[PDB]
Subunit: 214 residues, 4 copies
Amino acid sequence: PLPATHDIHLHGSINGHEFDMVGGGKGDPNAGSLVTTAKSTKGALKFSPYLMIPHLYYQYLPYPDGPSPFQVSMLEGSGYAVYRVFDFEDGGKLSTEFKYSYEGSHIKADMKLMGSGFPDDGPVMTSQIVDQDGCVSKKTYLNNNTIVDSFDWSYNLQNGKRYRARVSSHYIFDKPFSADLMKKQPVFVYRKCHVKATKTEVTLDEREKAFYEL
Amino acid sequence: PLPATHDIHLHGSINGHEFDMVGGGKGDPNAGSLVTTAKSTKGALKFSPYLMIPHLYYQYLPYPDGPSPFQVSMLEGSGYAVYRVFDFEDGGKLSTEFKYSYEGSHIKADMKLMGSGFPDDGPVMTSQIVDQDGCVSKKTYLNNNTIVDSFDWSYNLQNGKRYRARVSSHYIFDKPFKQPVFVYRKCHVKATKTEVTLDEREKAFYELA
Amino acid sequence: PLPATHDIHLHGSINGHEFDMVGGGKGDPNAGSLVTTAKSTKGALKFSPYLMIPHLYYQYLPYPDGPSPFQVSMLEGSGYAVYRVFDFEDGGKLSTEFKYSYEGSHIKADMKLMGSGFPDDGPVMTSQIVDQDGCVSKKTYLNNNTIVDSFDWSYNLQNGKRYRARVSSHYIFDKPFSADLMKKQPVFVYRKCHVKATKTEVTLDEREKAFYEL
Amino acid sequence: PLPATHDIHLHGSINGHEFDMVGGGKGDPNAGSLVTTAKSTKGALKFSPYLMIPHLYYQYLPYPDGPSPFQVSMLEGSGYAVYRVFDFEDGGKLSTEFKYSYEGSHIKADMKLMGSGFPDDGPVMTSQIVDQDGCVSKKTYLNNNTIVDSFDWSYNLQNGKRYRARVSSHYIFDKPFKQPVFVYRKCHVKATKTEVTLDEREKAFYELA
């Protein structure tokens, strides 16, 4: 079935310091929306809690003409993994790996994040981030079981400026895609992240809308 | 007034070889659509004619809730210049400069393109390009008179693969002035080694969710 | 003491397929040279064995005016971790994390590599790589305990062409650097990798020479 | 013959504002060193004078085992053009074009620089730059008449930080022709808002180990 609820476990290190967060949420796979809450298990985070965004489930994402490949993967009892690399404008780098397990309509996500190079006086380490702009991702097919995308992410800072990152994503599926499915590309997805956070807990309310053309 | 017709002059060099094209077209500033035809004045192009895409007028682009800054600029009798840098996946680089002059609803565009580093056996120099994917650009404001954007451009090749370029655009206005502003565009092209025609469609949006 | 011998354990996944290699080698910390041999523990590698290069120990690297920060770290009983991101020209991405432990002059290295987006018909997955060009890395200081570098890596292919990657490195130390040490930058390092490999075993003979100016 | 003296003319625009500088200098083609002085012809520059660095002649550059291709080109009465793209960490972009003419051992250089997207409060527009780090460029060959290079440029700021740019260079020769070839360079600069002087040192190498 399509997902209804999920658990999340984020862990790894940022600038050489380990962090760990656990939580979960729920979503509407018909609307492409979801909510996720994560709480630290090692006390206050040493970096902006917003760095955990957009990391806080494309299994909730439908396409204009039916379930997305991500949803079909879950429905058919298959699976996929997610790999991303964030190249921040000030030298910071963040690499991520997401793995999932399914139990009925409940998803369990294990997310490993490794970040480094964030200036100690930068927006991340000094928690200057206050929001993030809506964003459009571009998805295309690579090989026969991989979807690749790119997006230019931008956080909003207290001073009104923006903090940017060039992002690349690779979604690797355990089962190959059909020939007709691969004819439908690129696929664009507009997403907006509404966040509420503290030094120990972060909550994301994500909205998504995919389109082939406008 | 808003634009209705335009003429174009593209010139410069690709891999050290000069090229020159002239032509024009028209468009619908209420729909964001336009057509442009350019013909070489120096014989057959030595590189893929598709390299002239998307270079073949945002004055035809309306925004989600009214005229775009590009249109407002023209309506008020002001202007802007366009600068882009295309970073191709195989090392090729393309720098462009667009300047305009207006006469009523007619636009005259001068476009200078300087490209280098394209492998002689690559898709550009061996004309492997056959089409280009629809594309979404992300626009934000900088300083008091500049709009900046980025987009990941991708051509479709004869062999079924794609040929990508990371693109940056800077629109500098002559006078000081909701973001980001996204724009979906699709280019429909018909080309030969001496003439290229573009039918462009555009649709801007602030948000879809 | 300075290192004399080392063990290596590389593991992770490339394009969604797990791999694991173990081995080790020795080096000359006075010359900046070293040799490392790694052998697969899961049979033949599904990707070019050269992808394991340059991953196969800056503790062997001296500077023109004395032991490098990497060597001093080991000598003083401290330590550092290494994080890299390889951005390949054809979309491939490789993120790495190296951690070390020391026992006298013997180093134990645990290397985690996560790669994705390599085209199935590309030089990596079809093993077209036959060598790699000499390379110069540029090192500068960030914060008070991090060294950052960049280098433009290039493999040589059978057809005579090259396969490039833009690389970023972050070396995070457990102890902060002195003020005078940080005045000495950038530091450049020329390195050449001499490799011999098979689908199951790879051997690297690395040469290095650092300089502040020429 | 190898070069001994040169004149320079830099022009173009930065963030939509035109600039123009003229001057010249000399160098030692056996040592790879040279000096260049350029003075503004349009009053004080509106951006950091250091932005004119490293733009202020590889004809003075020898290689590890003999004259460089840049020198061979000049000696044989041929020539080459230089195209660079600077991708600055804060969004600024700079595209450059250098063309030369020779008269014996004297070189005349025409340099066009087009820059945009520099934040008005950034290090370039507020003149925060005070120096630049030594730098190593990596050169490789492409096609039959091009040399391509890359280098990670870094300016030093008044506040102690660095301001970086990812740079790509394409040297296109008029006629067809050991790699990579690395070149360490250091720029010693003295500048004011109207005049900039560069003392450049260069040393190429194929390998050091």
